[model samples]
Target: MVLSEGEWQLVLHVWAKVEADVAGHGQDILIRLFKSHPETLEKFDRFKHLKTEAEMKASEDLKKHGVTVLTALGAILKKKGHHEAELKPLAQSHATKHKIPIKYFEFISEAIIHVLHSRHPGNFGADAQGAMNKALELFRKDIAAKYKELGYQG
Candidate 1:
């Protein structure tokens, strides 16, 4: 699943809006993940006990963490997978520090597509969506391998 230069440009164009709204949109993605998979809530040490979106939303740590993730994600997206140095460390953190199951990245990928598609119903199309999904899947595949290499069953 590779993207041509033109497809990359198409994805970047549509995601520009998302980058602008990264802070809010990032939080929205996390909320969707938590809602879609309540078991995931226990993974977040800070918000593990949270039972409602309002509670999660009110947490300053959650907001900041979301923004930080999206900020790093924005950088990765801009480079089109050229940010291997950054991605490696991030993958290690999720796999090692957080012990997040590799499959959870799949859920995150789904939230990402849902958020983008819902926000840009008129502007986004199948091409851009497919490109974005492939890009994310590629990243997840890389991270999953890293997880395995680190001896994490996840």
Candidate 2:
């Protein structure tokens, strides 16, 4: 599905937060993502449905941690100059976490690029699709950096 500019920004900021360990922001953001984009969820894990009270607690934890992570990103996302380029890291994280190839996120990015450029005009670029892919590629590196900055654990 195509993503809007705001959605792209949300994805990026969310990725950075996920990499940052000191903050529980990534999990909270993910809970929101699952709630909003439940389709992204895989049914392979039955417990994913929150079948038990413990599972239910896990769900709550997800949202709480995700919200905490977003707090740090909100700073950049709320800025007037915020751009789609900023969100690539989070998008890349989604791809990496899924163990999908880089091209997978590119396919997703391709869909997003079309929507953002077409809907916004002037601010977006078509040639940048390749560059965008590269940006996401670099995002993996960026996330590692954030992990170091926060002393994150697996």
Candidate 3:
């Protein structure tokens, strides 16, 4: 969905607060996002961090790698209905290569959706964390497409 200025105000959607329940769910949600969105997070992440970053590492990394993936998303924002054209191959690649379950992607997206729903409501001082997650995912797709276009066998 195209975010309005109202949605623009919706920032800092997720905080990696150390919670038993939240941590427990992180793996599952990540799996689901992989299942549905597929090769994306990896590509998105390749530009962000080479591995699962610790909180402090993630914080430092965010400045150098992560935030750009999200902010750069504005360059390729699909006009709503075109999300499928944008996301489909990533979905197919996941099913075929990773052999992951699609429910995982749903779960992943839900986690993202939840973050936005919560953070935007809070009217947190100022931040683009929510959009970053969304943008990070897109960055991966852009890379993957370039991979194919370049015929790079990574």
Best-matching candidate per lDDT = 1
Candidate 1 contains a number of clashing pairs equal to 0
Residue 10's lDDT within candidate 3 is 41
Compared with the true structure, all predictions reach lDDT values of 0.81, 0.43, 0.42
- Candidate 1, lDDT over the whole model: 0.81
TM-scores, each model vs. reference: 0.92, 0.30, 0.35
Candidate 2, residues 56-99, lDDT tens digits: the string is 34665545644554553444334423434554455445444433
Q: Which stretches of candidate 1 lie over 4 Å from their true place?
A: none
**Whose TM-score is higher: candidate 1's or candidate 3's?**
1
Name the TM-score of candidate 3: 0.35
RMSD of each: 1.5, 11.3, 10.6
Give lDDT tens digits, candidate 3, residues 32-72: 34445545555444333434434324344334432432332
TM-score of 1: 0.92
- Evaluate residue 38 in candidate 1 and report its C-alpha lDDT on the 0 to 100 scale: 83
